[PDB]
Each structure stands twice: as C-alpha cells, then as structure tokens.
C-alpha cells in the first residue's frame, strides 16, 4: 500500500492496535507491518 522495501519477511508476536499499521525503530526503518488483506503482523529484516 505504498510502503516499498526489500528483505526477509516473517511473522511476529507483536499485536498492533486496530489503528496501528506500521512499526518504526530508532533508525526510522519499517520494522513490522500489518497486512491489509489478512490483518496479521509481519517482521521485516534486511539481508546484506
């Protein structure tokens, strides 16, 4: 939905609030995201 990235994607134990859609670390990166179609929570990590 406009949030573009590249890396390894897995699941997570975090539980966003209904209004919560993304998570940001100190590096302002996208750490975790909620999927629009399944409302689940996903962790994102880099690869290089």
């Amino acid at each position: 939905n406009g949030l573009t990235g590249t890396g390894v994607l897995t699941e997570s134990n975090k539980k966003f609030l209904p209004f919560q859609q993304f998570g940001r670390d100190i590096a302002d990166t996208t750490d975790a995201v909620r999927d629009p179609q399944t409302l689940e929570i996903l962790d994102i990590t880099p690869c290089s």
Binding site: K14, K15, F16, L17, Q20
Partner: protein, 40 residues
C-alpha cells in the same frame, strides 16, 4: 454527576513504552528543574 475541565498548551513530553506496546510513563519538560534534568 460532576465534570472536570482542563486546558492544553504547547509542551514537549517524554514518553516510555511497555514491553508490549502501551504507554506506561510520561515526563513533562516544564514541570520543575529536575524534569529538565531528566529530559536533557
């Protein structure tokens, strides 16, 4: 019944997050000099 009225002003605030995400503690910058120490 009873009610309480308060007013908002421009301030800087320091926020702490829990183990799992929920806000558990706050620090107000302009309360007293000790709070300025904590914020800086």
């Amino acid at each position: 019944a009873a009610y309480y009225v308060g007013y908002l002003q421009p301030r800087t605030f320091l926020l702490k997050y829990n183990e799992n995400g929920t806000i558990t503690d706050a620090v107000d910058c302009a309360l007293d000099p000790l709070s300025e120490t904590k914020c800086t």
